[PDB]
Amino acid sequence: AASGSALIFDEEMSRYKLLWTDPECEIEVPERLTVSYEALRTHGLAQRCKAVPVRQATEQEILLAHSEEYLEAVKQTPGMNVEELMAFSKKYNAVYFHQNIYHCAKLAAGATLQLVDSVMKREVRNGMALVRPPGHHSQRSAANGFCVFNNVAFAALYAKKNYNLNRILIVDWDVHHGQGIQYCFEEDPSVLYFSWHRYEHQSFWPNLPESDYSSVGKGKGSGFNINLPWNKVGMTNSDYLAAFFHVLLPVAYEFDPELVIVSAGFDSAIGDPEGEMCALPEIFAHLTHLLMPLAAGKMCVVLEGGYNLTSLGQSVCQTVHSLLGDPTPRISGLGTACDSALESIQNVRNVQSSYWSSFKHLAVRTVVVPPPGVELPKNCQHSISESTAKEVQRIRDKHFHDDQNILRSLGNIISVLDRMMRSDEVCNGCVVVSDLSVSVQCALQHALTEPAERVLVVYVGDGELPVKTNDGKVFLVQICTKETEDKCVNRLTLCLGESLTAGFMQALLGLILPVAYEFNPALVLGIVEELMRVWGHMTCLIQGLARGRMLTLLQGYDKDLLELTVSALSGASISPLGPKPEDVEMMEKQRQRLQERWGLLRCTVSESW
Numbered sequence: 001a002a003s004g005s006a007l008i009f010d011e012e013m014s015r016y017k018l019l020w021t022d023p024e025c026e027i028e029v030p031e032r033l034t035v036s037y038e039a040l041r042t043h044g045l046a047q048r049c050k051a052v053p054v055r056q057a058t059e060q061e062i063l064l065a066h067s068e069e070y071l072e073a074v075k076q077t078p079g080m081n082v083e084e085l086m087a088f089s090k091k092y093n094a095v096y097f098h099q100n101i102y103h104c105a106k107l108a109a110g111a112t113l114q115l116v117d118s119v120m121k122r123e124v125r126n127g128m129a130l131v132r133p134p135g136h137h138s139q140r141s142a143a144n145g146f147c148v149f150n151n152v153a154f155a156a157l158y159a160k161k162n163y164n165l166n167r168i169l170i171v172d173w174d175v176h177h178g179q180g181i182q183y184c185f186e187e188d189p190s191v192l193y194f195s196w197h198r199y200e201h202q203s204f205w206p207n208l209p210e211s212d213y214s215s216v217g218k219g220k221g222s223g224f225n226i227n228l229p230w231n232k233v234g235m236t237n238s239d240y241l242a243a244f245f246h247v248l249l250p251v252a253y254e255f256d257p258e259l260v261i262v263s264a265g266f267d268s269a270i271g272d273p274e275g276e277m278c279a280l281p282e283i284f285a286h287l288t289h290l291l292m293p294l295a296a297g298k299m300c301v302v303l304e305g306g307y308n309l310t311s312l313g314q315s316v317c318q319t320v321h322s323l324l325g326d327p328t329p330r331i332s333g334l335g336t337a338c339d340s341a342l343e344s345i346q347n348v349r350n351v352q353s354s355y356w357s358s359f360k361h362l363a364v365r366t367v368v369v370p371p372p373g374v375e376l377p378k379n380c381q382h383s384i385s386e387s388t389a390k391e392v393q394r395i396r397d398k399h400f401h402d403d404q405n406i407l408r409s410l411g412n413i414i415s416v417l418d419r420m421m422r423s424d425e426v427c428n429g430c431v432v433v434s435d436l437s438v439s440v441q442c443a444l445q446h447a448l449t450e451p452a453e454r455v456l457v458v459y460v461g462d463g464e465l466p467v468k469t470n471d472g473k474v475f476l477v478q479i480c481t482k483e484t485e486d487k488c489v490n491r492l493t494l495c496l497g498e499s500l501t502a503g504f505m506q507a508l509l510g511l512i513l514p515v516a517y518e519f520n521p522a523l524v525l526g527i528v529e530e531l532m533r534v535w536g537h538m539t540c541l542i543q544g545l546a547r548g549r550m551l552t553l554l555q556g557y558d559k560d561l562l563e564l565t566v567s568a569l570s571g572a573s574i575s576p577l578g579p580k581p582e583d584v585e586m587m588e589k590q591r592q593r594l595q596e597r598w599g600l601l602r603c604t605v606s607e608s609w
């Protein structure tokens with residue numbers, strides 16, 4: 001098992017800049033790299049990463065995605081003066097050249113290949129390449145949009161050639177549309193390319209009709225190119241998360257990529273002069289976290305855009321924070337996506353439904369408390385105090401009047417919760433219990449007693465659990481076998497077999513996560529009554545809430561389920577996964593029941609009365 005994150009950066013890619021007046025290219029400055037790395041240094045993130053050195057991409061590696069005529073023309077630019085460089089730059093659109101840019105372009109490409117080699121050789125779990133110039137706009141025989149060579153298209157073709165990868169997922173969250181990547185893998189069904197981008201009904205650069213939602217791919221690649229056009233500026237965190245939940249993640253998990261490559265352009269963040277969006281840098285901590293269960297965590301984040309020399313460093317730090325497994329920050333104020341974003345999401349879902357059936361529509365980190373003497377990852381530890389025992393005796397004499405082991409388990413619940421909420425010494429925990437009712441009441445009430453306003457309960461089992469949801473401070477997601485209808489607005493009951501896994505995955509991405517993210521709980525309470533081999537992806541993705549503070553209760557000892565739950569809470573890589581009509585009908589009925597209160601469930605524009 002690989003560990004650690006690779007950080008590939010070199011100050012040499014800062015040794016080229018614009019040498020003439022060009023208001024279109026004035027934003028792409030060398031200070032973008034320096035501010036980024038210095039931000040990672042100030043927060044101590046760069047030191048926690050393995051600094052894999054950069055290298056030059058060879059001529060054959062560059063020819064994987066570019067023609068010999070274009071490579072030879074760029075190869076001649078190191079010998080040009082400023083006048084010849086300006087004329088050469090004028091031959092292309094929205095790009096400038098420099099005596100050192102060909103060198104730096106080969107360094108940006110090689111740095112990306114170094115990142116791919118590091119992740120694929122299991123030398124690191126994931127990694128980021130702070131490179132310059134960006135790449136996602138450059139095409140086979142043209143420089144375009146500040147880009148010389150397509151570093152991400154290099155990574156995918158390099159991974160296919162040198163690792164026999166059949167499925168790669170490219171996620172381009174740069175605010176511009178990487179048309180170079182789309183062109184490269186237009187007919188390629190092995191490289192699924194997703195891209196949201198400021199479009200404004202084709203009025204924004206690069207002003208391409210094939211940047212619209214209607215471009216799904218050509219030939220055998222139909223359905224493996226997904227464009228989400230933002231037609232209004234000011235897209236928020238809710239717009240981005242709705243894009244992931246209702247477009248990207250369901251297709252990504254069904255695709256099951258063997259490698260995830262991120263065209264990480266942070267011009268889609270708040271404050272950037274080009275994107276003009278309103279997504280906080282914290283959203284990128286979640287954008288990568290929601291993708292980390294894919295490809296066993298093998299993620300290659302590659303820098304593209306981002307031109308606000310303040311939000312860029314903050315967004316880079318948030319992305320590295322999540323790559324290192326640090327607890328994701330809580331996102332508040334989430335709600336429905338705006339009408340323009342819902343229109344875009346609905347349009348891309350409809351056109352992609354012919355290729356992904358889930359879009360069709362009707363007309364110490366972890367503390368472990370096993371049973372006494374059960375007898376563990378290096379970032380885990382075991383478990384009482386005088387105040388804990390006195391509180392347990394008070395709860396017993398008050399509510400549970402008239403067993404030493406169960407009372408000991410309740411004391412473990414209290415100590416684990418006190419160590420999770422009242423300090424940063426422990427992030428999450430898992431406890432094996434016997435009596436469910438008493439343990440659930442103690443966990444929930446003590447969690448609400450300590451500073452935890454809202455609690456997201458995730459109970460997998462049948463029967464009614466002692467948890468009142470008619471107050472707003474608790475939301476119950478119950479994965480059961482029998483149907484209990486759905487009355488309370490604070491209760492999402494799902495009663496989903498072979499397709500059960502996929503149905504649960506669809507219900508997790510399209511219902512559970514949007515509700516949980518808008519709910520923004522201070523603690524997640526997982527309960528499993530005595531199939532559940534999707535718990536790892538559930539536990540990993542549910543850790544995006546409450547700064548990862550999750551307490552799991554397991555009724556009955558299951559060495560497989562206990563080890564899986566501890567592995568997921570500790571942050572180890574999640575193994576990949578490789579849909580009944582009654583299940584999707586029950587899911588959409590639950591959506592129609594709850595989307596009025598939880599607008600993040602909406603993937604279609606609402607029809608007014």
Ligand SMILES: NCc1cccc(C(=O)CS)c1
Nearest residue numbers: 024094145146176205304305
């Ligand atoms: N509006 C200027 C412009 C033109 C082309 C590309 C870009 C990027 O930012 C690419 S990341 C900006």
Ligand SMILES: [K+]
Nearest residue numbers: 172174176195
């Ligand atoms: K994009």
Ligand SMILES: [K+]
Nearest residue numbers: 185188191224
């Ligand atoms: K494709």
Ligand SMILES: [Zn+2]
Nearest residue numbers: 174176265305
């Ligand atoms: Zn961009």
